Amino acid sequence: GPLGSEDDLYRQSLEIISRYLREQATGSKDSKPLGEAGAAGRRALETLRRVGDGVQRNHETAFQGMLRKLDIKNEGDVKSFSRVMVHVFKDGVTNWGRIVTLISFGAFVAKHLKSVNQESFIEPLAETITDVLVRTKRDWLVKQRGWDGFVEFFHVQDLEGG
Template sequence: MHTMKISHQETYHHQTGALDTDTRQLIKCVLGQCTGLLKPRWNESKALSTMSRVVGQLLEKHRYTYNGMINTLYVDDRGDDVKFLSAVAHIIFQDGTVNWGRVASLTSFGAAVCQYLKDKGRDNCVEVAGEEISAYLVTHHKDWLVKHNSWLRSNGFVEFFPVAEPESRSRNIIMTLVGLAGIGAAMTLLVM
């Protein structure tokens, strides 16, 4: 009997390929649910139900802040271009710290943008925003996501956010965004 030995590198590439797919699916589903364009299913994954719960709580608590940021970013003037979400992500992670609270904060801001755009009749932007956020995460933080047990094939995200208040884990990130939203020079980068 011949046994195949799978290298660490092959295992990593398999994990990261699945991670790309899982991330895109998760983020797009959460944004779809937050906008009402996608209804929750009774058999959804723990990661999806956890992310939906956390994002919903953050949206409820920080609606005013997110709306101010949307106005500061001149979202109405951008048409269907949501590339500014990657620029916001760069600001969130600019100090090199990656954690689930920041991932949830980025996703909740993306959900606020999607709700705003849907209300303006631009439903197609939800898919594009989901792609923008997930592409940023898997491009810039893939190793971190794999190392911290990702979401759909493991429980890293779910374990970080047990059924409890996400506020304490996300407050600092949101306060940083609020501070940056008030600084015209920092936001100029996002307007370009």
């Protein structure tokens, strides 16, 4: 319908997440600026990547272990993926850390897929995670100012000017 049907958050999220998955899966630390996403996209990208790569390393056995179990081979693996997301949000608690983990796990999956040259499942997975992650609690994204709130909450005592 009107403006209430438009989702500018979706545009930014799709942009940031798909890019994040592609740069992470290829090991490309040099990703094109979030100009088409938003000013806060850059801060979100650097923060999301640092936390994502960090939680994976801090929990190598847990993250790599769970990753080995959820090996993508067909479209049927997408259904279980959403269930894993729903499993985390099962209590109804919408927090940024839970969003970063869901994206970090997805990033690890993309990294794993790229390693076996399964790009055909990476693109759909990135978009699926984005839509499912954003649509499940889009009302929360709006309340938290989207990625702007993500960088604000994840980086409270930030210097900003340096």
